[PDB]
Design a protein around this nucleic acid. Structure first.
Lengths: 110, 98, 95, 84, 95, 110, 87, 97
DNA sequence: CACGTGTGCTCTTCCGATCTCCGAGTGTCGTTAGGCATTAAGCTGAACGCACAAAGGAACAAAATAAACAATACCACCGAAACAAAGAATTAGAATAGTATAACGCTAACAAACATAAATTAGATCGGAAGAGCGTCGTGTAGAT
DNA sequence: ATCTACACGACGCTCTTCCGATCTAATTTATGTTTGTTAGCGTTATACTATTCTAATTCTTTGTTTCGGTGGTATTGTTTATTTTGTTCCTTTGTGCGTTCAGCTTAATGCCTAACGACACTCGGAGATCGGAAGAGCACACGTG
């Protein structure tokens, strides 16, 4: 059957993250019997904002380390240096990520 | 006359190097046999994926590094620079694990 | 022949080109960003579900997602996230 | 395949524990730290591997997946990124 | 006229008479035992639900409850609980 | 309509805790689409065993304190003295419960 | 007929005897003099963390009052589960 | 005069308030403190009395547990007096700072 | 302290490569369009409970005071730990080989959802009593001298 | 060894909270039907285990020697116990009204089902940032003048 013009729900909201996949994962994730229409749009916008907040500092760490490619060390450097992303991911371990360069001031030589 | 450093200098250099680098610090072949020994208490003849022992190694290394950070805080609080068994036990008491 | 291994890899690649058009990403870092999105989706969706269970509603709506973002994300991130969410909800409701 | 292992805790060595301590920023390490740290790592590994063997026994499998380790760490509030 | 305030108060009273037929209980202690049962029910049911979600089953069965008890309860309590559960499941399946 | 003999599901399993109420709270609690028949029987047996394990030590604390009635202090004394119930309820606050009598050995007089 | 009251500087109501008794229950024998202002700040940031979650819980409920269930849920949210007030 | 030694009735207070199960903050300062704090998130906020009782019980339990951890961190430093650095170390190893 | 010595890391430059970037199928999962059940929004009366107010008792808090004990600053000595050169040994990587197992794919039986009526059970509502909260005298414990 | 301040211990006087009796709604269960979920069995390919060989990286031994912990001694603020006088908190007694909160509608909204097509996944090649290696230079640790 001939339809109207096809347009994804992530394009109506101006998003890069999929609205339909987040709606599918909400409906098949056993959270409620019903999921409203603004819930996946809101959640995908929050997820795209958080992923952009991560990558915008990970690219800065990669550019500071003279690198044109993001490795897990750059993600750990972006997360543990931000003051408020460290509260969101305080109980999270990153593989091949290492720790921050952090020597206590009493251990430094005299 | 040969050349020797002072105690703590090469230690601080390795602190900066292993804080800078992201490689695993324990060899994989002892860790596979240790995980295989530990899992025999719960089930015998258990095969392991390589990725499973790798994930166990990353998580165990991260847990030990974070525990040594808390241990170093608890040892600096006691006006010392070395770490002692009571520092590890105090960190595990305040963390609420034992 | 096998099952299709669904992921979030193309969307993290789409967002990275909007932010840094010169910087690439690894495969390990792509898996870490995949687990990051999959963990915060679980946090926000579970806390919105228990918000709907407390007030005895049977629908997770945009209010529940906004309240769960306000409960979960700290500080500046919560108000920047509710701006980014509400502006997308209005842009989706205009169309 | 008739193989039973014993006393593999000494395979994780004192030079392999001093590097784990110096990643965490420890400048000086006393000598009683090593057997204690082997015991601490042992009880942590028994907790995580007991949870993972429970996870793969519910799955009716005879091998341990990396996802079982990931879920066993998520159960303890020690979420791991990099393995699914 | 109002909503009936469902609770677990008569069952904690039934169990106390099987254990200590001479000892009474307060109202504050009854509310604390109510919140105790309501919290461990939430723990076991949520962890069994995520067990069913991991192995891609759509049914919480007695195996999921047994595995969740083994994951949650420590030490002696887990094996005493799986004995108490399995013996009740066999006594329920005989009838 | 004339039925057979009525008999509750908690009486078939020899339980004091309700099988039907736990089945209702599992079905309306958003955990899965399906709940098996042995799940509420198993969960009610585990809950009755745990509540009996609590009350059997709370009554002992009440009888040790010359009391014929359980107060919240007796529940706290039963929970924090048991070695393995304290792991199950380590992050739980009891109202009007107090703490254990616990003075460190360095604070005692000489 | 309006007497709207807004409050200020109620952190001093938690007195130094009232803090010394809270330390006495925890097993503290000697308490330094600088403890009390730090303890008031710790209690204030803890109550800010709990009360912000509780006010969020009760304005999602569209209620102008804070119930005890909102405090119970705000404490469970932070992993500080409380028994004796419903749940 | 029958002045005691310093710390003796402190130990008796330890035993008494460990035996006791009451609230140690008075309800009228704590109600005004919660009413002051909650104004910044919403003005004209009525409270259930049981909600302020729950806030009081939870705040006192949090502070008693933090003072237990503080006492451990001060015993480790070869002292009997708790200091604000002990509270800071307990809050840092606990993972709140 | 202040200048020469030698080392570790950094920097600069060059070569394979293997890990990343793009191209081409292709199922599969998101999109669209009605249509239907149902959940939540709006309006409203009852009353429940919260805020505010007054008054008196008291209970706790604030302020001054002696002093006893604990934190802290400093110093001498040991013993243990870091650093380093050398040989052993154990690990790493590629390569063979064998295969247990696990991840698919049908098949079906069996177990659970759904609906309805009957009735048993649990919560609300009073009311009588009994464990207990509290006031008064007793010895004991125990701490200070 | 002696004295005095709490603290349980026993007894008694109201009391108020706990336990029993009743009434009714509502939530559980019995029976039957329908569906869709997972156990059973077979298979293949694949990743796990086991093993050889050589390289080679790291572990272990041992010999310094440095410095950090640890015990001990001294001193001065300072926290604690106590008493007295406000001071405000608790308890009661009263009032008013504001905000829950249940109840009754219906309007919007989400679920469902099916057809269609765009999108992400997988496979498969091309290239290029980067891992590794050679040579030189500087920050810097450390040692004599």
């Amino acid at each position: 059957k001939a339809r109207a013009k096809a347009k994804t729900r992530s394009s109506r909201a101006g998003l890069q993250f999929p609205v339909g996949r987040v709606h599918r994962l909400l409906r098949k994730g056993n959270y409620s019997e019903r999921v409203g229409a603004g819930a996946p749009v809101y959640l995908a916008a929050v997820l795209e904002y958080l992923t952009a907040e991560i990558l915008e500092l990970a690219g800065n760490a990669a550019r500071d380390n003279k690198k044109t490619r993001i490795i897990p060390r750059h993600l750990q450097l972006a997360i543990r240096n931000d003051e408020e992303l460290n509260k969101l991911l305080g109980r999270v371990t990153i593989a091949q990520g290492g720790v921050l360069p952090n020597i206590q001031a009493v251990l430094l030589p005299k | 006359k040969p050349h020797r450093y002072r105690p703590g200098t090469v230690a601080l250099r390795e602190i900066r190097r292993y804080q800078k680098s992201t490689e695993l610090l324990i060899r994989k072949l002892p860790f596979q046999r240790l995980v295989r020994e530990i899992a025999q208490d719960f089930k015998t003849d258990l095969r392991f994926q390589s990725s499973a022992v790798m994930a166990l190694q990353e998580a165990s290394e991260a847990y030990l590094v974070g525990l040594f950070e808390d241990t170093n805080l608890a040892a600096i609080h006691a006006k010392r620079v070395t770490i002692m068994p009571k520092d590890i036990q105090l960190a595990r008491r305040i963390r609420g694990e034992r | 022949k096998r099952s299709r291994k669904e992921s979030y890899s193309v969307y993290v690649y789409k967002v990275l080109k909007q932010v840094h058009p010169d910087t690439g990403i690894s495969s390990k870092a792509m898996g870490i960003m995949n687990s990051f999105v999959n963990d915060i989706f679980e946090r926000i969706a579970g806390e919105a579900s228990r918000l709907a269970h407390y007030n005895k509603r049977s629908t997770i709506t945009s209010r529940e997602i906004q309240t769960a973002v306000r409960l979960l994300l700290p500080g500046e991130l919560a108000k920047h996230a509710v701006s980014e969410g509400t502006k997308a909800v209005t842009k989706y409701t205009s169309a | 395949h008739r193989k039973v292992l014993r006393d593999n805790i000494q395979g994780i060595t004192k030079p392999a524990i001093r590097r784990l301590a110096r990643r965490g920023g420890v400048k000086r390490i006393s000598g009683l730290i090593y057997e204690e740290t082997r015991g601490v790592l042992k009880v942590f590994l028994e907790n995580v591997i007991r949870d993972a063997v429970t996870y793969t026994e519910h799955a009716k499998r005879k091998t341990v997946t990396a996802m079982d380790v990931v879920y066993a760490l998520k159960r303890q509030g020690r979420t791991l990124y990099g393995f699914g």
